[PDB]
Design a protein around this ligand. Structure first.
Ligand SMILES: [K+]
Ligand SMILES: [K+]
Ligand SMILES: [K+]
Ligand SMILES: [K+]
Ligand SMILES: [Mg+2]
Ligand SMILES: [Mg+2]
Ligand SMILES: [Mg+2]
Ligand SMILES: [Mg+2]
Ligand SMILES: [Mg+2]
Ligand SMILES: [Mg+2]
Ligand SMILES: [Mg+2]
Lengths: 140, 252, 119
RNA sequence: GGUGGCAAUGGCUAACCUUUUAUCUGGGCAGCCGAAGCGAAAGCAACAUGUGCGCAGCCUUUUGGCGAGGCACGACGUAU
RNA sequence: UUAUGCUAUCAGGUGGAUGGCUCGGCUCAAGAGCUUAUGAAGGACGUGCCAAGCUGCGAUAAGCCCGGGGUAGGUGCAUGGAGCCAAUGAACCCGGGAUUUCCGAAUGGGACCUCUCCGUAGUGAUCAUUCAUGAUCGGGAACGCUCCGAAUUGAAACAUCUCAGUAGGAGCGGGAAAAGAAAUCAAUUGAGAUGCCGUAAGUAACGGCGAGUGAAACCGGCACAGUUCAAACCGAAUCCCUUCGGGGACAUGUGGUGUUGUAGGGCUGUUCAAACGUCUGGCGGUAAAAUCGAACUUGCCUGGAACGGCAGACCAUAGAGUGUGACAGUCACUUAGAUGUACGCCAAAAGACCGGAACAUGUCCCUGAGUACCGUGCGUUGGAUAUCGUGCGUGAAUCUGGGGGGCACCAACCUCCAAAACUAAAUACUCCUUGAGACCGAUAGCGAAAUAGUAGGGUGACCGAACGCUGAAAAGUACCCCGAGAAGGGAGGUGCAAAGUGCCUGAAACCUGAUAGUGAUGGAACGAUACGGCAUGAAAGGAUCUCUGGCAUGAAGGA
């Protein structure tokens, strides 16, 4: 706190001088009392008692990097000028493997001919790419 | 935009196009941040020893003796160890484990450096900063200033450029400061006069080194605190041709 | 001798205060006269008991005399004619700092003195 | 929170190297946060705006119009 | 003359604040890093011409000898007397020696005896070797390794948990230590010793699933380094001591070979030729005290004294700083920059030496046991049926082999080869050295600005202070008077100034006196406000300001 502003206040913003003694003025140390007197506070701060679900091992579980077809479509020219994609007879050839993405999702619009090769596609990504005139290629 | 270059006699003998570092807007707030961060990163840990005032076995007498409940020596009534006891520990002293370093992002530190470099071109900022000079800013010197090896040659160049008055101001303005700094080793309060920036390591570093208030550095070793001593921009600086050439993408 | 290793006043004064005797010899240096500096190649030499010096600072500026005595611990010399008359009236020498005087004639009864002054 | 740098083609680097004696300059993409959520998990995976009201501001015949942000819907992803 | 008192100021005393100064402290960084039976550290006692403490030294005793550096003085903290030493080169510093009492690992025996007994003169204890000899012991600020191991506390009680493998203990031990060359980590296919740092991440995991506790791998860096045995085959082909005669070890195996995973090695045959390493060598670097190092001590003024002011003259690869009678680039030491250096340390050219690497063939040989594993108990761990340890019990296999891949087993795939050994660097620490500092500035900063772990306190384990400062120079007050005076006072001196020795400045409380006001008929939060008496009102405050009136305009109000 601003120590200088409280020089002369005696209690220094604490109320009574009998405040500010120990953990008794906080109701205990840490997040104690979450079943008894900090029960509602535990609900508010998310520390309510209980267990839920199970964790799978990190060595089998995996998350996939994603990119929506709108993001690919409306910055594909930047990808070609940066080298990560090429234009073959007018069709953008994007390989998500060198982008670090493994699943194409279907959010957005596809306005150009995208020939996209990726480890996985959502169904909607499939229709949006194929209706734009392009195709989807799985990574063997 | 463009700046004239003066030979060692002080006469303009050509033109140089100033890099984009020189048309950067004036940002005293960012300059202040950069200089304060560098000063803080220079600082040194300090504090009392680990158990200073606390290496006693003093314990309280308790109630029933007509005395305060402070800890006392086991074989005397002399109070010990408490911050309001004589010889007791300092409550809340400086800690050697305290971290005084400040971070400034490299982008905004470079922005501050560019702002301070552009501030060396404004006559109003430089004269308001304290400097005495009669030249036309910015001062770009031909590269032969870098090859001169004696202080007398630097004096002749600075006099031909109308900059030596600032050096004399720094020399005669050197004053013994007030207070405890003299005993700690900061006997004088020094002034800053002239910044010479060279293209690379040359004899002009040693040659101009001993001038009073003068800093001579290269473009690589150029930072915010040299260009804005005390967080104030507007340092009177002499750039060389090589320095201006080497400043094209220096902080952008 | 105190290098630029330490620019701190405390270390400088500690070095001077606890200087060994062979270092306190160099503290007795004094400026040589123009003739002596020309004919020795050095700017200064240690004041020795016997050589003639001219006092150039203090209450006795301009006096020329021979060094009567040198104290290495005090870093003072005693010069003929530089005295303090005391309440008895007897005349007592007033010690001088060697940096306040100038050597005008060297005592060269010691064959080692020439190399002592330089090299 | 106030003040700033940069900004989805994002931000910042950590250790460390460069110190020519702690600053500093230039490097350093490892990593972290943001960028997609929902689900215990398997897994699957969304609007670059479809509509309305309407503040500021602008235009205006001074009563209306357009209306970023805001508000209210509609639609969609996923769990149940 | 109102006493005893009260209030304010002043003078003085007491006191030691404040200010200024500081050879001390503290913190951080960079270095450097073991020592002792050839008797250490530590302690006791002694040691000085006058010497009590501390410091140094040891009956040769604030010291002795030699070489180098230094050179004219020296005789510690600590300028007193009287001497002594020193140009036969002292003092001092660097290197190397000598002396070195008693106790102490203490070690011929014994210690409420720092001494004492035998004197056969001293290898005390435990060990290795042939029995010549050798090793170990104690100490070291922290750091390191091994083992033993609480409670307060938190959970708002408390028991698992936490505190915490903390505190504390025992052993070992070096400049570092430990670890260390996969029976590894991965995952569909990869990497490739260890340590340390960053991150993963407060994630996985544990948990009255409460409070809390809590990784690793991958990845980015620092620094990089690999190898030696046991065995197969050979069989004394070896190693050690030595008085150089010989002696000891050794067939229960010295030595050679060999050293490992898509196996390696041996044995048989063929080919290529020999890399790493050890020793010598000292080009040259590092390297003692230390040496040299520019340029003013010019005029006037002020002053006790210029480093100041005003003129003038200069140096700068040197304007870091400190000292010097006040502020110094040019007075001194320095600095920047160059030199030199005994013993040492690293060290390239060039020589001497054991030797290295591929392939073919395989009813061939070898490849670590109370071990790995498992059962059960306990500790520990994030380790969860899936941490590590170790108590008890049980207990394999041998390349057609064995282990691992987070419950067990089966199968597939991937991966390695334990139960033997060593191994630089990167890392840690701070007794010590150097440097630095938005650190402290004498009730602070270390307890200690050190006659400080001291005085002093405690039977003991142990607890533990206070104390800095004359002045430029002692010029440290002559002579005289009083006084019992080697006290003190007066007078008189010194000094710019008494600053007159625990002496710079010199606050307040407190005490003595003086001055102003008041005061022996008087009522108490010691004041605020208004008006008066007395005193003061030099500076720093007013001068159409103060006093006293007139005139004009005058709000609210209004006789
Ligand atoms: K509690
Ligand atoms: K309780
Ligand atoms: K002087
Ligand atoms: K000075
Ligand atoms: Mg030991
Ligand atoms: Mg509790
Ligand atoms: Mg090992
Ligand atoms: Mg734990
Ligand atoms: Mg200098
Ligand atoms: Mg103290
Ligand atoms: Mg202290």
């Amino acid at each position: 706190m601003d120590t200088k502003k409280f020089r002369g206040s005696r209690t220094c913003g604490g109320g009574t001088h009998k405040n500010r003694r120990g953990a008794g003025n906080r109701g205990g140390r840490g997040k104690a009392g979450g079943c008894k007197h900090h029960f509602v506070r535990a609900m508010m701060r998310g520390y309510s008692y209980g267990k839920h679900g199970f964790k799978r091992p990190d060595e089998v579980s995996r998350d996939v990097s994603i990119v929506n077809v709108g993001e690919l479509d409306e910055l594909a020219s930047y990808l070609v000028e940066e080298g990560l994609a090429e234009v073959k007879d007018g069709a953008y050839h994007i390989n998500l493997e060198n982008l670090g993405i493994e699943k194409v999702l279907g959010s957005g619009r596809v306005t150009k001919n995208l020939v996209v090769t990726s480890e996985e596609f959502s169904a909607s990504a499939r229709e949006k790419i194929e209706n734009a005139g392009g195709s989807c290629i799985d990574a063997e | 935009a463009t700046a004239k270059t003066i030979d060692l006699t002080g006469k303009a003998v050509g033109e140089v196009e100033l890099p984009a570092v020189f048309d950067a807007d004036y940002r005293p707030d960012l300059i202040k941040k950069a200089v304060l961060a560098a000063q803080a990163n220079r600082l040194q840990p300090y504090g009392p020893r680990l158990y200073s005032g606390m290496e006693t076995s003093a314990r309280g007498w308790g109630s029933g003796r007509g005395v305060s409940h402070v800890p006392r020596l086991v074989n005397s009534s002399r109070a010990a160890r408490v911050p309001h006891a004589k010889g007791g520990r300092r409550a809340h002293p400086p800690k050697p484990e305290a971290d005084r370093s400040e971070k400034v992002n490299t982008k905004e530190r470079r922005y501050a450096i560019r702002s301070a470099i552009a501030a060396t071109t404004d006559p109003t900022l430089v004269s308001l900063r304290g400097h005495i000079f009669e030249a036309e800013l910015p001062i770009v010197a031909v590269n032969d200033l870098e090859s001169l090896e004696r202080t007398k040659q630097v004096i002749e160049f600075l006099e031909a450029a109308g900059l030596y008055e600032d050096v004399l101001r720094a020399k005669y303005g050197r004053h013994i400061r007030a207070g405890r700094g003299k005993l700690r080793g900061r006997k004088y309060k020094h002034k800053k006069s002239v910044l010479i920036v060279a293209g690379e390591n040359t004899p002009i570093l040693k040659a101009a080194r001993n001038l009073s208030g003068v800093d001579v550095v290269t473009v690589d070793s150029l930072n915010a605190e040299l260009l804005a001593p005390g967080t104030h921009a507007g340092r009177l600086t002499v750039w060389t041709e090589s320095a201006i050439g080497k400043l094209e993408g220096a902080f952008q | 001798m105190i290098a630029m290793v330490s620019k701190q006043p405390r270390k400088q004064r500690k070095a001077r205060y606890a200087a060994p005797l062979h270092i306190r010899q160099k503290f007795m240096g004094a400026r040589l006269s123009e003739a002596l500096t020309k004919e020795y190649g050095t700017r200064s030499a240690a004041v020795i008991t016997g050589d003639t010096v001219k006092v150039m600072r203090g209450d006795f500026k301009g006096t020329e005399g021979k060094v009567q005595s040198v104290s290495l611990m005090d870093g003072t010399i005693t010069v003929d004619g530089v005295i303090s008359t005391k309440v008895d009236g007897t005349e007592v020498p007033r010690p001088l700092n060697p940096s306040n005087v100038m050597i005008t004639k060297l005592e060269m009864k010691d064959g080692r003195r020439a190399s002592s002054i330089k090299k």
